[PDB]
Amino acid sequence: AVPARRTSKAKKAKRRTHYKLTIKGLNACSNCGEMKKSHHVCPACGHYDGKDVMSK
Amino acid sequence: MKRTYQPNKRKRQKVHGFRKRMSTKNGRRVLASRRRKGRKVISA
Amino acid sequence: YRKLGRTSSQRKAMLRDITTDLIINERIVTTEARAKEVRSTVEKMITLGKRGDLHARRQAATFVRNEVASVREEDESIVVESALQKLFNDLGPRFAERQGGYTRILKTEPRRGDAAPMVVIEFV
Amino acid sequence: ELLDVIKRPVITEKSMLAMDEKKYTFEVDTRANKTLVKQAVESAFDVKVANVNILNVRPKFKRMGKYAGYTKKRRKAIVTLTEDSKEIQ
Amino acid sequence: QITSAKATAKTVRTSPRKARLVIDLIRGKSVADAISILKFTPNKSAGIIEKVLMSAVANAENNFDLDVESLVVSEAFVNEGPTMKRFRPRAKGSASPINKRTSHITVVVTEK
RNA sequence: AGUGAACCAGUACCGUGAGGGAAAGGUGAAAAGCACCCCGGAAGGGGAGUGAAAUAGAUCCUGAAACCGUGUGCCUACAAC
RNA sequence: GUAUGAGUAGCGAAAGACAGGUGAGAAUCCUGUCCACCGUAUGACUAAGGUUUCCUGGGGAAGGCUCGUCCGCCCAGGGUU
Ligand SMILES: [Zn+2]
């Protein structure tokens, strides 16, 4: 099977309307304020749930 | 699956080299036609 | 129970290795599917380390890796602990009075070459 | 011709070690003998020679600026002495 | 007084179609929001746009402007750069071409 | 176009061989070819400077079309073009 | 010279895991530990053939079907008695 006709600019772009990116739940840290992914450790300060985790 | 070109050093000089081209009268036709074109290599 | 991209004997090898780590190190970075399967396996080892007897020891020795050391110990010798000896002398007595739930998982970040979601699994 | 035969000395890290066993490295002429080099060295310094050794060196492909071609050929001879010394620096 | 600053990256070795998925997530945002949005997207071009955005901000601060807190991402786009041409060997003795594409990336920031 | 060849061309490349055989000219009058600073590993960029002009910055005279984008005045989710 | 097919087919037989190093940046480079594969060969030596690919110190624009701090790649020196 081979395309019998080339596809135009409008139909290409109408195909490409469900082809995007999303940036889902982003919150602010409770300890240091900066934004972070919910249910994840904060990469800026290593605090999750009010305690220090990436330290010893 | 053996291909056609199998390299060898003696054969290439004995079939295509300068002295083989010099020993026949048609070899020298070849060498003159190559010198007349400007080839940097006139005989293998 | 989560095939993990492997055949039946390679899954078993991989789990036997990742749980002997974390007995020796107590904190590890891994992907998120492996960490769940491993929480299950490691706590099954700890409730044999709490049982204590010879039958339990030989049951664990079918699953804990052997020629691995775990040493922070010297009185005056080269005295080595064996990572099954640690299971039975150290980690069982630690969790004596706790019921199940000897581990916990935290989520960090996706790996650069992969976008694989990574995770830290630790003990207390 | 005894004075066009030896060209110059070789000064590398493998040749400094040889000077401590009484051995000296020279780039000599192509078309030279073991014997001819020996004569030339005994003539130009007044030493006594045990044993020249001799090698040939291939040229190397080089490529500077979209133009490529080979360096020279080379001849290297290593001269051993009985007891005397030459001072090159 | 001018209130605006641009930066640009030229002939970066990423494809212009994929870089456009990331840059539509950032247009019209405050500079405060764009950085965190870029830090949590794992697409190869997310971290390149991060450097171009940070150069726009440094230019604003040092050459002309002030007020990093007022800035907003006002313009953004991705154009095409020159492409390299290669060939990959195929079955049965033939070969087919391969395009190695490039992008120019430019960001602009205004005081508001 | 004019010699295959205005440029390091009977060259690179192709073939065991005889033999076949290309692509590729132009900153500015003068290199005055961007000292110094800032972001960045670098590449690249923004100021400041040279210059009559840099959107003349070396992929450098002019810079058409296909093709790819960004912004907007008007139209569009009961319709067979 | 540039589109469409389309961010689609494919990425060329096979077992890895974790700790620690280096670094701007690490599934892919280094060091360790355990695990797994060949073993009339996937081990050792050699004649053709190739022709510097060999060793040491640097590099990361292109080549490497991903990555790369690495390399049979790139730059500088050196090696065959
Ligand atoms: Zn925080």
**Spatial separation of the C-alpha atoms in residues D72 and D38, rounded to whole Å:** 24
Helix (H) or strand (E) holding E42: none
A18 touching E, CB under 8 A? no
The 10 Å CB-count burial string (b at 16+, else e) for E74-108 is: eebebeebeeeeeeeeeeeeeeeeeeeebbbbbbb
Question: Phi/psi of residue D22, each to 5°?
Answer: 70, 55
Consult the annotation and say whether C17 binds a ligand: no
How many angstroms is C1' of G58 away from CA of D12? Answer: 20
Cross-chain residue pair C106–A41, CB shorter than 8 Å: yes
Q: Would you state the structure tokens that stand for residue A14, as one six-digit string?
A: 């109408």
* A21–chain E Cβ distance below 8 A for any pair: yes
Breaks in chain E listed by the residue before each, with C–N > 2.5 Å: none
3-state helix, strand, coil in chain C (%, to 5): 40, 15, 45
CA separation for the pair E110, E112 (Å, rounded): 5
Regarding chains A and E, contact by 3 or more CB pairs under 8 A is answered as: yes
Distances (CA, A) of E42 to C106, C116, E30: 19, 10, 21
Nearest DNA or RNA nucleotide to E9 (CA to C1')? F44
- Locate A1 and state its tokens: 């099977």
d(Cα E64, Cα B5) in Å, to the nearest integer?
Answer: 70
- Give dist(CA E80, CA E35) in Å, integer: 24
- Measured to protein CB atoms, the chain G nucleotides within 7 Å are 2-5, 7, 12, 15-19, 25-28, 33-36, 48-52, 61-63, 65-67, 75, 77-81
From the CA of E75 to the C1' of F73: give the distance in Å.
Answer: 21
Dig out the tokens for C106 from the structure.
């935290």
Helix, strand or coil, per DSSP, at residue C113: coil
How far is Cα C114 from Cα C109, in angstroms, rounded to an integer?
11
F17 C1' – B15 CA distance, angstroms? 9
Tokens representing C120 are: 């830290």
Pairwise CA distance, residues C15 & C26, whole Å: 15
**Distance, CA of B40 to C1' of F22, in Å:** 17
For nucleotide G65, the protein residue with its alpha carbon nearest to C1' is E88
Considering only alpha carbons, which residue of chain A is nearest residue C107? Answer: A40
Tokens of A7: 């596809």
Q: How far apart are CA C17 and CA C20, in angstroms?
A: 5
Could you give the 3-state DSSP secondary structure of residue D77? strand
CA–CA dist E68, C85 (Å, integer) = 59
Determine contact, residues E21/A20, Cβ cutoff 8 Å. Answer: yes
Q: Which two tokens stand for residue E45?
A: 């071009």
Domain that residue C87 falls in: 1-124
CA of A29 to the centre of ligand 1 (A): 5
**Cα dist from D10 to D1, D14, D16, D61, D78, whole Å:** 21, 10, 9, 21, 10
Determine the distance in angstroms separating the CA of A40 from the nearest CA of chain C, rounded to an integer.
5
For residue C49, report the phi and psi dihedrals to the nearest 5 degrees: -65, -25
Spell out where chain E has E strands.
4-12, 72-80, 84-89, 95-100, 103-110
- Give the largest CA-CA distance in chain E: 66
Q: From residue A21, how far is each of A40, E18, E43, E49, E72 by CA, in Å?
A: 21, 10, 10, 15, 21
d(CA B17, CA B22): 9
**Count of positions (residues) in chain B:** 44
Type and span of the H or E element at D43? helix D34-45
Q: What are the sequence ranges of the domains in chain B?
A: 1-44
The whole-angstrom separation of Cα D24 and Cα E3 is 75
- Cβ of C107 within 8 Å of Cβ of A39? The answer is yes
Q: What is the DSSP string of chain A?
A: ---SS---HHHHHHHGGG-------EEE-SSS--EEETTS--TTT-EETTEE-S--
Protein contacts on strand F: list nucleotides below 7 Å from a Cβ.
Answer: 4, 8-12, 15-21, 37-40, 42-47, 59, 67-71
> What is the residue extent of each domain of chain E?
1-112
Enumerate residues 6+ apart whose C-beta is below 8 A from C116: C31, C110
CA distance C98 to C74: 30
Of D88, D15, D78, D89, nearest to D49 by C-alpha is: D78
What technique solved it? cryo-EM
A49 touches E at CB < 8 Å:
no
Is there a contact between E36 and A21 if contact means CB atoms under 8 Å apart? no
Provide the residue ranges of all domains of chain D, joining segments of one domain with +: 1-89
Nearest chain A residue to E43 by CA: give it.
Answer: A21
Give the resolution in Å. 2.9
Q: Ligand 1 mean position to C34 CA, how many Å?
A: 27
Nearest residue to E72 (alpha-carbon basis) of E103, E17, E35? E35
Q: Report CA(D63)–C1'(G73) in Å, whole number.
A: 15
Strand, helix or coil for residue E92: helix
Chains D, C in contact: 3+ Cβ pairs under 8 A? no
Q: Are E62 and E93 in contact (CB under 8 A)?
A: no
Whether chains A and C touch (3+ CB pairs under 8 A) is answered by yes
Amino acid identity of residue D22, one-letter, is: K
